[PDB]
Design a protein around this motif. Structure first.
Motif, PDB file in Angstrom:
ATOM      1  N   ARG A   1     -24.124 -52.194   8.624  1.00  0.00           N
ATOM      2  CA  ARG A   1     -24.332 -52.591   7.333  1.00  0.00           C
ATOM      3  C   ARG A   1     -23.171 -52.749   6.356  1.00  0.00           C
ATOM      4  NH1 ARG A   1     -28.467 -49.522   6.855  1.00  0.00           N
ATOM      5  NH2 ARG A   1     -27.617 -48.612   5.021  1.00  0.00           N
TER       6      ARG A   1
ATOM      7  N   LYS B   1     -33.859   2.760  -9.352  1.00  0.00           N
ATOM      8  CA  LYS B   1     -32.492   2.361  -9.613  1.00  0.00           C
ATOM      9  C   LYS B   1     -32.447   2.218 -11.247  1.00  0.00           C
ATOM     10  CE  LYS B   1     -31.594  -0.454  -5.678  1.00  0.00           C
ATOM     11  NZ  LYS B   1     -31.614   0.896  -4.993  1.00  0.00           N
TER      12      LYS B   1
ATOM     13  N   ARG C   1     -34.415   7.769  -7.812  1.00  0.00           N
ATOM     14  CA  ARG C   1     -33.286   7.401  -8.501  1.00  0.00           C
ATOM     15  C   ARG C   1     -32.659   6.236  -7.611  1.00  0.00           C
ATOM     16  NH1 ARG C   1     -33.508   7.574 -11.629  1.00  0.00           N
ATOM     17  NH2 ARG C   1     -32.932   9.596 -12.796  1.00  0.00           N
ATOM     18  N   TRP C   2     -32.896   6.391  -6.386  1.00  0.00           N
ATOM     19  CA  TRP C   2     -32.337   5.207  -5.408  1.00  0.00           C
ATOM     20  C   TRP C   2     -33.325   4.037  -5.573  1.00  0.00           C
ATOM     21  CZ3 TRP C   2     -28.741   8.876  -4.570  1.00  0.00           C
ATOM     22  CH2 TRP C   2     -27.530   8.518  -4.040  1.00  0.00           C
TER      23      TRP C   2
ATOM     24  N   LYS D   1     -30.840 -49.500  10.701  1.00  0.00           N
ATOM     25  CA  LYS D   1     -31.369 -50.642  10.165  1.00  0.00           C
ATOM     26  C   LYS D   1     -30.190 -51.836  10.266  1.00  0.00           C
ATOM     27  CE  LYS D   1     -35.143 -53.391   9.411  1.00  0.00           C
ATOM     28  NZ  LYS D   1     -35.820 -52.651   8.495  1.00  0.00           N
ATOM     29  N   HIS D   2     -30.215 -52.891  11.070  1.00  0.00           N
ATOM     30  CA  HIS D   2     -29.130 -53.927  10.952  1.00  0.00           C
ATOM     31  C   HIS D   2     -27.820 -53.381  11.116  1.00  0.00           C
ATOM     32  CE1 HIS D   2     -32.547 -56.368  10.290  1.00  0.00           C
ATOM     33  NE2 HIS D   2     -32.558 -56.042   8.860  1.00  0.00           N
TER      34      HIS D   2
ATOM     35  N   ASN E   1     -34.252 -26.680  -1.361  1.00  0.00           N
ATOM     36  CA  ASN E   1     -33.947 -28.351  -1.129  1.00  0.00           C
ATOM     37  C   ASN E   1     -35.081 -28.805  -0.157  1.00  0.00           C
ATOM     38  OD1 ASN E   1     -32.467 -29.261  -3.188  1.00  0.00           O
ATOM     39  ND2 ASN E   1     -30.446 -29.602  -1.960  1.00  0.00           N
ATOM     40  N   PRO E   2     -35.461 -29.757  -0.316  1.00  0.00           N
ATOM     41  CA  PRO E   2     -36.532 -30.570   0.704  1.00  0.00           C
ATOM     42  C   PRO E   2     -35.953 -30.482   1.862  1.00  0.00           C
ATOM     43  CG  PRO E   2     -35.694 -31.874  -1.179  1.00  0.00           C
ATOM     44  CD  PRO E   2     -35.398 -30.686  -1.736  1.00  0.00           C
TER      45      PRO E   2
ATOM     46  N   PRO F   1     -32.112   5.364 -14.142  1.00  0.00           N
ATOM     47  CA  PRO F   1     -32.377   6.926 -14.403  1.00  0.00           C
ATOM     48  C   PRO F   1     -33.197   6.889 -15.956  1.00  0.00           C
ATOM     49  CG  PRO F   1     -30.145   6.465 -14.062  1.00  0.00           C
ATOM     50  CD  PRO F   1     -30.802   5.094 -13.804  1.00  0.00           C
TER      51      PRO F   1
ATOM     52  N   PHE G   1     -19.989 -54.582   5.496  1.00  0.00           N
ATOM     53  CA  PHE G   1     -19.382 -56.129   5.580  1.00  0.00           C
ATOM     54  C   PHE G   1     -19.898 -56.825   6.662  1.00  0.00           C
ATOM     55  CE2 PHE G   1     -16.434 -53.604   2.882  1.00  0.00           C
ATOM     56  CZ  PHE G   1     -16.176 -54.274   1.899  1.00  0.00           C
TER      57      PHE G   1
ATOM     58  N   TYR H   1     -34.510  -4.626  -9.014  1.00  0.00           N
ATOM     59  CA  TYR H   1     -33.447  -5.341  -9.583  1.00  0.00           C
ATOM     60  C   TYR H   1     -33.833  -6.302 -10.987  1.00  0.00           C
ATOM     61  CZ  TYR H   1     -30.409  -3.967  -5.729  1.00  0.00           C
ATOM     62  OH  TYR H   1     -29.830  -3.247  -4.856  1.00  0.00           O
TER      63      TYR H   1
END
Lengths: 63, 171
Positions: free
Chosen positions: B165, B50, B46-47, B161-162, B150-151, B52, B167, B141
Motif C-alpha cells: 500500500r 519499614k 523494623r524491616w 491488505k493489498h 497496555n492492551p 520506626p 504508492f 511502601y
C-alpha cells in the motif's frame, strides 16, 4: 475484446484502489493516535525493566 | 502535601540504658545469647513495617530486656565484668584479642552464677525465625495503584491488505 472486459476490470481496479486509499487514511489516523497516547502495540518506548530490582533485605532496614 | 505524623514525646520516653560502648562490647556475646528474642522481634518489625514511627513499643521492650540483663550481671558477676570491660576500654580498637584472661573469668562467673555460655564462632550471626503476632504489612511502601498494562497484542496474522500500500507498488 468486449466492453465488459474494460467494465469489470475497472470495477476491480477501482475497488482495490479505493480500499488502498481509505486504508492509508486509517493508517495516518492510527499512527497519530498511537503516537499521541501510546496505548497501542507500536510506538512503545523503552522503560527500565522491573526484574533488575533487588528485593533482598539490605543493611539499612527502612531502605 | 500531607501530614508528617510524629508520635508525641511521651511514647519515646524509654528508660535509656546507660553503659559505655566498651561495657557493651564486653558483654556482647552473652547479651546476644540471652536477649535474642526482643532484638529479633524489634528488628523484624523494623524491616517489615519499614517505619520506626510504628515499632516504638518493640524499641521499649528491647531496652527493658537489656536493662534486665545488665541488672542481672550487676547482681551476680559485678567484679569480673568490671575488670573485663575496663581492660576492653583500655584498647583503642577494643579488641578481644588482648583480653582473654578476664574474658575467662567473666565467662566462668556467668556460667556458674547465671547459667550462661558464650555463643560459638558464627552462632550469633545465623538468621533466626521469630514468632511475632503482628500482621504482615500489606503495603509497606505505601505504593499507589499501578497503571493498567497496555492492551495485549494477540490474534492470527493475515497478509497485509493489498500488499505494501506504498504508492504504485501493488505487491
Amino acid at each position: 475484446d468486449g466492453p465488459e472486459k474494460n467494465y469489470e476490470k475497472t470495477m476491480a481496479i477501482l475497488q482495490i484502489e479505493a480500499e488502498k486509499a481509505e486504508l492509508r487514511l486509517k493508517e495516518l489516523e492510527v499512527r497519530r493516535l498511537m503516537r499521541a497516547r501510546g496505548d497501542g502495540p507500536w510506538y512503545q518506548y523503552p522503560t527500565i525493566d522491573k526484574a533488575l530490582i533487588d528485593h533482598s533485605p539490605k543493611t539499612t532496614p527502612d531502605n | 502535601p500531607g501530614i508528617v505524623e510524629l508520635p508525641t514525646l511521651e511514647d519515646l520516653k524509654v528508660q535509656e540504658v546507660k553503659v559505655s560502648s566498651s561495657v557493651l562490647k564486653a558483654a556482647a556475646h552473652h547479651y546476644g545469647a540471652q536477649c535474642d528474642k526482643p532484638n529479633k522481634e524489634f528488628m523484624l518489625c523494623r524491616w517489615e513495617e519499614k517505619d520506626p514511627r510504628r515499632c516504638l513499643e518493640e524499641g521499649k521492650l528491647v531496652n527493658q530486656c537489656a536493662l534486665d540483663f545488665f541488672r542481672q550481671i550487676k547482681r551476680h558477676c559485678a567484679e569480673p565484668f568490671t575488670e573485663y570491660w575496663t581492660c576492653i576500654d583500655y584498647s583503642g580498637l577494643q579488641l578481644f584479642r588482648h583480653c582473654r584472661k578476664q574474658q575467662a573469668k567473666f565467662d566462668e562467673c556467668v556460667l556458674d552464677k547465671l547459667g550462661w555460655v558464650r555463643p560459638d564462632l558464627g552462632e550469633l550471626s545465623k538468621v533466626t525465625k521469630v514468632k511475632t503476632d503482628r500482621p504482615l504489612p500489606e503495603n509497606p511502601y505505601h505504593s499507589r495503584a499501578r497503571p493498567e498494562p497496555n492492551p495485549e497484542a494477540e490474534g492470527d496474522l493475515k497478509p497485509a491488505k493489498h500488499g505494501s500500500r506504498l504508492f504504485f507498488w501493488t505487491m
